[PDB]
Design a protein around this motif. Sequence first.
Motif, PDB file in Angstrom:
ATOM      1  N   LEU A 270      -4.227 -14.143   1.179  1.00 61.64           N
ATOM      2  CA  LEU A 270      -5.480 -14.222   1.967  1.00 61.64           C
ATOM      3  C   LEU A 270      -6.733 -14.227   1.055  1.00 61.64           C
ATOM      4  O   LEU A 270      -6.652 -14.590  -0.127  1.00 61.64           O
ATOM      5  CB  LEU A 270      -5.571 -13.098   3.040  1.00 61.64           C
ATOM      6  N   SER A 271      -7.886 -13.833   1.604  1.00 63.97           N
ATOM      7  CA  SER A 271      -9.117 -13.683   0.818  1.00 63.97           C
ATOM      8  C   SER A 271      -9.618 -12.227   0.809  1.00 63.97           C
ATOM      9  O   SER A 271      -9.424 -11.500   1.785  1.00 63.97           O
ATOM     10  CB  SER A 271     -10.210 -14.588   1.379  1.00 63.97           C
ATOM     11  N   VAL A 272     -10.281 -11.825  -0.278  1.00 69.30           N
ATOM     12  CA  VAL A 272     -10.845 -10.467  -0.435  1.00 69.30           C
ATOM     13  C   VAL A 272     -11.657  -9.975   0.773  1.00 69.30           C
ATOM     14  O   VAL A 272     -11.891  -8.772   0.950  1.00 69.30           O
ATOM     15  CB  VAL A 272     -11.693 -10.334  -1.742  1.00 69.30           C
ATOM     16  N   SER A 273     -12.082 -10.921   1.598  1.00 72.46           N
ATOM     17  CA  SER A 273     -12.746 -10.624   2.855  1.00 72.46           C
ATOM     18  C   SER A 273     -11.691 -10.347   3.930  1.00 72.46           C
ATOM     19  O   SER A 273     -11.718  -9.298   4.573  1.00 72.46           O
ATOM     20  CB  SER A 273     -13.646 -11.798   3.264  1.00 72.46           C
ATOM     21  N   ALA A 274     -10.757 -11.287   4.100  1.00 74.84           N
ATOM     22  CA  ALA A 274      -9.706 -11.208   5.133  1.00 74.84           C
ATOM     23  C   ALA A 274      -8.709 -10.035   4.962  1.00 74.84           C
ATOM     24  O   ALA A 274      -8.267  -9.450   5.966  1.00 74.84           O
ATOM     25  CB  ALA A 274      -8.965 -12.550   5.251  1.00 74.84           C
TER      26      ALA A 274
ATOM     27  N   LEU B   9       0.786  -1.231   0.000  1.00 77.87           N
ATOM     28  CA  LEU B   9       0.000   0.000   0.000  1.00 77.87           C
ATOM     29  C   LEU B   9       0.830   1.299   0.000  1.00 77.87           C
ATOM     30  O   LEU B   9       0.353   2.350  -0.472  1.00 77.87           O
ATOM     31  CB  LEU B   9      -1.031   0.009   1.150  1.00 77.87           C
ATOM     32  N   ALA B  10       2.045   1.236   0.562  1.00 78.45           N
ATOM     33  CA  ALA B  10       3.011   2.358   0.489  1.00 78.45           C
ATOM     34  C   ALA B  10       3.424   2.580  -0.958  1.00 78.45           C
ATOM     35  O   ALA B  10       3.515   3.713  -1.391  1.00 78.45           O
ATOM     36  CB  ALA B  10       4.231   2.086   1.358  1.00 78.45           C
ATOM     37  N   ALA B  11       3.631   1.487  -1.688  1.00 77.98           N
ATOM     38  CA  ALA B  11       4.065   1.499  -3.080  1.00 77.98           C
ATOM     39  C   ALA B  11       2.932   1.772  -4.080  1.00 77.98           C
ATOM     40  O   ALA B  11       3.163   2.326  -5.160  1.00 77.98           O
ATOM     41  CB  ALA B  11       4.725   0.186  -3.419  1.00 77.98           C
ATOM     42  N   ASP B  12       1.714   1.363  -3.728  1.00 80.68           N
ATOM     43  CA  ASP B  12       0.519   1.579  -4.577  1.00 80.68           C
ATOM     44  C   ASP B  12      -0.726   1.796  -3.731  1.00 80.68           C
ATOM     45  O   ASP B  12      -1.352   0.820  -3.257  1.00 80.68           O
ATOM     46  CB  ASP B  12       0.312   0.380  -5.499  1.00 80.68           C
ATOM     47  N   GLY B  13      -1.057   3.060  -3.503  1.00 84.83           N
ATOM     48  CA  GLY B  13      -2.223   3.399  -2.702  1.00 84.83           C
ATOM     49  C   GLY B  13      -3.562   2.994  -3.316  1.00 84.83           C
ATOM     50  O   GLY B  13      -4.544   2.873  -2.599  1.00 84.83           O
ATOM     51  N   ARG B  14      -3.593   2.781  -4.638  1.00 86.08           N
ATOM     52  CA  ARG B  14      -4.839   2.486  -5.373  1.00 86.08           C
ATOM     53  C   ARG B  14      -5.020   1.013  -5.653  1.00 86.08           C
ATOM     54  O   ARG B  14      -6.053   0.627  -6.203  1.00 86.08           O
ATOM     55  CB  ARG B  14      -4.954   3.267  -6.692  1.00 86.08           C
ATOM     56  N   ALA B  15      -4.032   0.196  -5.275  1.00 82.01           N
ATOM     57  CA  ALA B  15      -4.139  -1.264  -5.314  1.00 82.01           C
ATOM     58  C   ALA B  15      -5.430  -1.768  -4.694  1.00 82.01           C
ATOM     59  O   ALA B  15      -5.873  -1.298  -3.623  1.00 82.01           O
ATOM     60  N   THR B  16      -6.059  -2.721  -5.373  1.00 82.31           N
ATOM     61  CA  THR B  16      -7.375  -3.195  -4.937  1.00 82.31           C
ATOM     62  C   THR B  16      -7.300  -4.418  -4.032  1.00 82.31           C
ATOM     63  O   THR B  16      -6.381  -5.243  -4.165  1.00 82.31           O
ATOM     64  CB  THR B  16      -8.299  -3.493  -6.129  1.00 82.31           C
ATOM     65  N   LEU B  17      -8.284  -4.513  -3.131  1.00 84.87           N
ATOM     66  CA  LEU B  17      -8.434  -5.630  -2.200  1.00 84.87           C
ATOM     67  C   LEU B  17      -8.176  -6.967  -2.915  1.00 84.87           C
ATOM     68  O   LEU B  17      -7.518  -7.864  -2.372  1.00 84.87           O
ATOM     69  CB  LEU B  17      -9.835  -5.602  -1.573  1.00 84.87           C
ATOM     70  N   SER B  18      -8.694  -7.059  -4.141  1.00 84.64           N
ATOM     71  CA  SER B  18      -8.415  -8.134  -5.091  1.00 84.64           C
ATOM     72  C   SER B  18      -6.908  -8.415  -5.246  1.00 84.64           C
ATOM     73  O   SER B  18      -6.413  -9.338  -4.607  1.00 84.64           O
ATOM     74  CB  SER B  18      -9.118  -7.835  -6.435  1.00 84.64           C
ATOM     75  N   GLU B  19      -6.187  -7.632  -6.057  1.00 86.67           N
ATOM     76  CA  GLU B  19      -4.764  -7.913  -6.363  1.00 86.67           C
ATOM     77  C   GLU B  19      -3.838  -7.987  -5.128  1.00 86.67           C
ATOM     78  O   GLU B  19      -2.743  -8.555  -5.204  1.00 86.67           O
ATOM     79  CB  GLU B  19      -4.202  -6.949  -7.446  1.00 86.67           C
ATOM     80  N   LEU B  20      -4.293  -7.447  -3.995  1.00 83.67           N
ATOM     81  CA  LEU B  20      -3.564  -7.583  -2.722  1.00 83.67           C
ATOM     82  C   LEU B  20      -3.663  -8.998  -2.162  1.00 83.67           C
ATOM     83  O   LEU B  20      -2.704  -9.507  -1.584  1.00 83.67           O
ATOM     84  CB  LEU B  20      -4.043  -6.578  -1.654  1.00 83.67           C
ATOM     85  N   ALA B  21      -4.827  -9.624  -2.328  1.00 83.83           N
ATOM     86  CA  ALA B  21      -5.056 -10.984  -1.844  1.00 83.83           C
ATOM     87  C   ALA B  21      -4.149 -12.038  -2.503  1.00 83.83           C
ATOM     88  O   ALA B  21      -3.724 -12.960  -1.817  1.00 83.83           O
ATOM     89  CB  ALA B  21      -6.525 -11.367  -1.941  1.00 83.83           C
ATOM     90  N   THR B  22      -3.843 -11.890  -3.802  1.00 89.29           N
ATOM     91  CA  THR B  22      -2.865 -12.768  -4.469  1.00 89.29           C
ATOM     92  C   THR B  22      -1.496 -12.711  -3.774  1.00 89.29           C
ATOM     93  O   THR B  22      -1.115 -13.658  -3.068  1.00 89.29           O
ATOM     94  CB  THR B  22      -2.664 -12.469  -5.990  1.00 89.29           C
ATOM     95  N   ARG B  23      -0.777 -11.599  -3.965  1.00 93.49           N
ATOM     96  CA  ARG B  23       0.560 -11.372  -3.380  1.00 93.49           C
ATOM     97  C   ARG B  23       0.667 -11.673  -1.867  1.00 93.49           C
ATOM     98  O   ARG B  23       1.641 -12.299  -1.427  1.00 93.49           O
ATOM     99  CB  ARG B  23       1.049  -9.938  -3.690  1.00 93.49           C
ATOM    100  N   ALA B  24      -0.324 -11.239  -1.080  1.00 93.41           N
ATOM    101  CA  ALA B  24      -0.330 -11.476   0.380  1.00 93.41           C
ATOM    102  C   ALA B  24      -0.647 -12.922   0.793  1.00 93.41           C
ATOM    103  O   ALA B  24      -0.053 -13.446   1.746  1.00 93.41           O
ATOM    104  CB  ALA B  24      -1.277 -10.508   1.086  1.00 93.41           C
TER     105      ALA B  24
END
Lengths: 147, 147, 147, 147, 147, 147, 147, 147
Positions: free
Chosen positions: G30-34, G13-28
């Motif tokens: 988890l699930s779009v809920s978690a 999020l420091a690197a991309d403030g507009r990153a979506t809950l979606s594409e964060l769940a892949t790299r991290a």
Amino acid sequence: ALDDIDRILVRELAADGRATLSELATRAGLSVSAVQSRVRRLESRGVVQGYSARINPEAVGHLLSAFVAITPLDPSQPDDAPARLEHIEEVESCYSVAGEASYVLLVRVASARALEDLLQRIRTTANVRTRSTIILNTFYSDRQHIP
Amino acid sequence: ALDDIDRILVRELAADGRATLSELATRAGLSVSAVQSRVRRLESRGVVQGYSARINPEAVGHLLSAFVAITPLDPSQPDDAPARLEHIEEVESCYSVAGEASYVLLVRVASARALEDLLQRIRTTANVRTRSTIILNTFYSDRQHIP
Amino acid sequence: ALDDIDRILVRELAADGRATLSELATRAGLSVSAVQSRVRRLESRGVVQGYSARINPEAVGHLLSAFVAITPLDPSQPDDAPARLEHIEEVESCYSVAGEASYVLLVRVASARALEDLLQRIRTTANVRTRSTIILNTFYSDRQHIP
Amino acid sequence: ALDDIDRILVRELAADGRATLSELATRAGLSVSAVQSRVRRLESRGVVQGYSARINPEAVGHLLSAFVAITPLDPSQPDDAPARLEHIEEVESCYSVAGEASYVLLVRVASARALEDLLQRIRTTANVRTRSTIILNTFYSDRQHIP
Amino acid sequence: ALDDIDRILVRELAADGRATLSELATRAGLSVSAVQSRVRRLESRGVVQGYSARINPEAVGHLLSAFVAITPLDPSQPDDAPARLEHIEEVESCYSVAGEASYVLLVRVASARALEDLLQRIRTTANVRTRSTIILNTFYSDRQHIP
Amino acid sequence: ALDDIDRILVRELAADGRATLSELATRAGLSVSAVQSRVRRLESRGVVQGYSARINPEAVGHLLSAFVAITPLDPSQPDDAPARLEHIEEVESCYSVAGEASYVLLVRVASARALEDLLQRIRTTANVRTRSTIILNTFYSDRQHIP
Amino acid sequence: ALDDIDRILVRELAADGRATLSELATRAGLSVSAVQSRVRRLESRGVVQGYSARINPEAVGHLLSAFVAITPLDPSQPDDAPARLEHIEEVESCYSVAGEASYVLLVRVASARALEDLLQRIRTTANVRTRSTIILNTFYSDRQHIP
Amino acid sequence: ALDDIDRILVRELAADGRATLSELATRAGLSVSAVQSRVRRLESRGVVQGYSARINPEAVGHLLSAFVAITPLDPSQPDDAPARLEHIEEVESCYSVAGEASYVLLVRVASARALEDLLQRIRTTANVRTRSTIILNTFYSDRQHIP
């Protein structure tokens, strides 16, 4: 010395470079012939060095002016910095000085980013460190005083 | 607005401020009337601020020049200093500046003792501390550059 | 001007203040009468101001010397600091200067603790701030050069 | 050792370095032989370092004086600077100092242009940066105090 | 007066300030009575100024140390500053100093926010400007040397 | 943490290093057995690091103290200056610092001339430039504050 | 503490403030809920303080940026400079600092002449002296490092 | 080009960088497609440089922040420093600057000991001297102003 008709001549030409041989003869108290003589001799002897219009630097796109104090890095080399920077056209003035630096330049540039570039050019060409003082405003400039 | 004709005119006037309108006209490809008109506009806008004979400071008895950096003893007061020093005739130029000082002055004077009395005068009329840097030599000055 | 027999006289008296009219006449090439004339006139005109033995300050109990740069605090008051400190005997020399300070003093004192006291005395008597530079060693002092 | 007789003698010699032994003898309550003997001992110990005529620097053509603070370009090298500058004749005094600079010089010179050439010479022979403070006036100097 | 026995005693006490008189006696070749007597005299003269446990500043919660150089806003006033700051408990040491500042303080504090509030307190009680230098690490301290 | 009986113990030992297990038990409110336990553990954990008498430096012949700020000249070399100067006995304290310099030393020396020598020794041994601030007077030193 | 899934979340999020809950769940992993849970809690606790686009200041007409170091002139008055300048919109940032100044501001302005005006406004409103350092170029700004 | 719609968009994105296109559209009076298009252009021109979560530096373990001013040991070399320090992750920002230093860095670090090791790293990779100013508190930061 300098007789105080030559002093009235230099006073009046410092204040108005475009003043005519005519209107000078009134205030000074000579003739359009005798005035023109004194002036040509004032210029022969290096008393008046030239005539210039005073251009506003901001009008011509020079939005940032600086003093730049420079000190040669290598004292084993000849100290020719003024002659080295002579071709750089953004240096308006070059003085040697008794202070911390060896020379002070007055420099004019389009922007802060153009100053950064100019500073590096100065450093690599003359072989000196730079310390600059940014000018924010000219209140008055070249008011020549004739005692 | 500053077109190619105007740039030509300011160039020629920076280099020779007594250039006659006829000389200017043939260099700009204009009539003398159009020249005179352009030049009046340069003057009425802020672009040409005046004309001056470049006088040799040593020939009129100003054997010592100095930069003087000045800092207000109380900077919270809105600042008076350029208007107050305007009446000291040996102050030739006054610039406000960023960094530790608030203004830099170029000053010209007959001798060392006259410098010391001038500095007392500047400290008292502007309410300032002074830091002085004596000029040893002027290599070149006032070389105005029109880009 | 100064003829270069008066120059050989001043050269030799700078180097040896106790040199006799006798041994001066050999090296210079005059007579014990003619030498004594030139000297008395060199002193009449303020060319030689006096004769002094050079006392080692450490030998007489002055173990700490300093330059002390001073700046008057109140520019609305007359600037008479040199005359004010004239009676303080530990001030050996007082110069006005073109720099950050208005005056530089050379001062000699018994110890670091005596300097602290002297500094406060200087500050309260002349009405100035002080900045001091401690001297650690004199390599040579007053080698007068006669060109 | 520095007794009351020795203090008397160093006082009188500081104030008048050409005082004759007979004058000194009657002021100290001694014979001329005892005087001459005391004085030789002051000289052989470190107490009296020489005698000099105080010469007016302006009368012999030294119209500009300056302090020059110097800092080695490479301070790790054991320091050469006083011995190297010893051969520059316009250096009158050399002190090592605490604070930012390593040494202070008092220097005397004919003019501004001669100062600038002297500074290049000092930078190169000692390998140093320079910081210069022009003396405007000497109010009093060399007033040696014997406590 | 400081004889070889006294030097022994001050050495041993610098290295171990809880050394018992009996231990000291056998190390100095004296009786316990002579020891105790010598030590009382060291204390009554100015030589031993006190005894202290060297406490770890971080263990008692002083996680941030700093030097603070202070300069009086009005140096003409005779100077109050050490007595006034004496009542601020986080000031551990106070030295007067030559150069630009008048005093240096060593100060110790819980954190950055506590440092900033301490500095306001120092500015106001002593009427001073402050210049702060944070200590990052103490390599060794208080290593007293008896020559 | 540190219970506030250990705090009363450290408070009292900072103020009096020679205080006995006896007189500590009164003020603290424990027994000569229980006091001696806490102290030995305060020392086990590096809370009290030692005990020292506070020697007046002037009494033992150290008439000049200085802060000496040092900066390594060559950043390509390991920065081990503290370990390099560890054997120099006139360095009492060594701190790394966040400021202009990398380290500040407190140094004590017999005279101004001995400081000059020490400075050169510091420069050639660690490979650093030095800037020194002379101490004129200690008002108080090591008043440890236990919050 | 902060578990190293919250660390991967803050890194990204420091690197991309507009990153979506979606594409964060892949790299991290988890699930779009978690993911959305952790983020909302990262913001609840003041770990992520907000989201911002990084605007180029030059694009929006801010051609000159400066650091401005400020020091309150009167230590008898409360030190509230940050709160006083809070309404001035050209001050982007305000830090208290341990150095020569009490605060450093980052300021952005249209031109050198607008900076002069802003400086005077700062001085008269908070009651401080100013020292400014002009920025010539940003190479990179706010690269947040998450260890 | 920067019209009234573009100004609206950059404002909203500075204040909330995760604003959805639909929210932006109704605030600008546009369709979501026109919004997305405008925003892409802001990004492709130099106007919006990225989006970032504002992270609390203390929450991720950066308990100490500092400005570090840096000056090249050899300024004649064309200058490397921003590219070389780019790989040190604790450097958050790098600005070139006018005045005595060449660049200012904002740096963030876990502690005092980590600061000292970071400074050695900066001195060696960029070949620079450092001058450090610790930040005590951030009152407000990154308050971007769109005029």
